[PDB]
Ligand binder design. Sequence first.
Ligand SMILES: CC(=O)N(C1CC1)[C@@H](C(=O)NC1CCCC1)c1ccc(F)cc1
Length: 451
Amino acid sequence: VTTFVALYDYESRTETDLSFKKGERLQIVNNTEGDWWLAHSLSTGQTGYIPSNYVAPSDSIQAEEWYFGKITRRESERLLLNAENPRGTFLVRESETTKGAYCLSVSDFDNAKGLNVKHYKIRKLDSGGFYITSRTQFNSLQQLVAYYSKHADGLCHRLTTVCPTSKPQTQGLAKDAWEIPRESLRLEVKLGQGCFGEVWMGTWNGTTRVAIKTLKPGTMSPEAFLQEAQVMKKLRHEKLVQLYAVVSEEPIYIVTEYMSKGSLLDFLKGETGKYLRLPQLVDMAAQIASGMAYVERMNYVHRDLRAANILVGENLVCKVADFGLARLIEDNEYTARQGAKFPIKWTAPEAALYGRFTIKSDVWSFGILLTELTTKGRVPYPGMVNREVLDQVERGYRMPCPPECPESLHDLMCQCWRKEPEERPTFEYLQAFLEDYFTSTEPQYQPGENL
Ligand SMILES: CC(=O)N(C1CC1)[C@@H](C(=O)NC1CCCC1)c1ccc(F)cc1
């Protein structure tokens, strides 16, 4: 039994889980594994299961507000570059490139680069202490942060503000919540309409904001959906919209992680996508590619990858939604890859012609998606009707490089559009290509030699 501290507030939805406020002290066992831990709160004397990502052991670095653990270099920059953060906003993370070194990431402002993030490798001493520059050593990470909060002393700027963040999603709505009753869900605001149902913002069990998709009766077999949903339930990645729960009887409701900024396609159009710069668009493509690289690793298939099925959150977070759902659609026309509801302009020819949906036809759809990303959301094949597209694509026509899409990205698109699926790149490749698309000379980490 270790004492853990609550990193965030958590409102107890159910009977068996535990409500707690941040800073509460909770007793939890030695080895316990999984997403939900049994806890006893010393602070309240109350008992119940807790989401394990909401706690850390007392008096660890993981309990420190400014410690973001395994966050990626690119993702730390996403959070730190929020325009509301003052200069000197910071976090500490593990180094991606150097053993059990840590890294201090700090927001800054420059007359050359503007708003930018500087990264300082924090190395550990034989003593167990830490240092950024060997001339100034500390016994602990906390002492290090305290010192550079008072004096830049070589750093680009004094540490001012702990990087802010939203409470993380829990994994599942509760321990053992999966098939839920319609009554647990309050549909609050209808957000959109599709061919086969609607999308809602809602609340589960009076506590938790969720998205709810409602399907038109007869869209899918409830039994088939349930069987697939067991498979989708296992797909867990920061760039995949989480599938929380399902109401299995007609009409089917699908309960999902709520994404505050709506679909990428809508986002690209209108009063916010007009301003996006290429590095932001490439970072959004890189997030999407990372989610699809997980799908690829898991030997799954999206089947309808396009901007309308990417959802946007705070700070240009992008997540893949509705993976695998298209396969269950019971509509004679759609299943034929035919009709006004089939996204033929995103569909690889072998998927259109022979129904061969694979990760490589998703790769083709990603190439089309890159086209939406670089045109503020214009429909692909602009002057072509859905009826012509397949034959043109089979004959070898490919969209030209959109205006103000760099040629190197269009060459990436053309790779995604090879006729032969096995000659299209992997999402693994796409993610690395897009993550490394912009480079510099040697500035990765600030030379902490002598500040
Ligand atoms: C025409 C159309 O809107 N769709 C199908 C062509 C693909 C949408 C659709 O009907 N969504 C429903 C309506 C609101 C949410 C649920 C769609 C998107 C991804 C999928 F995995 C499955 C269906």
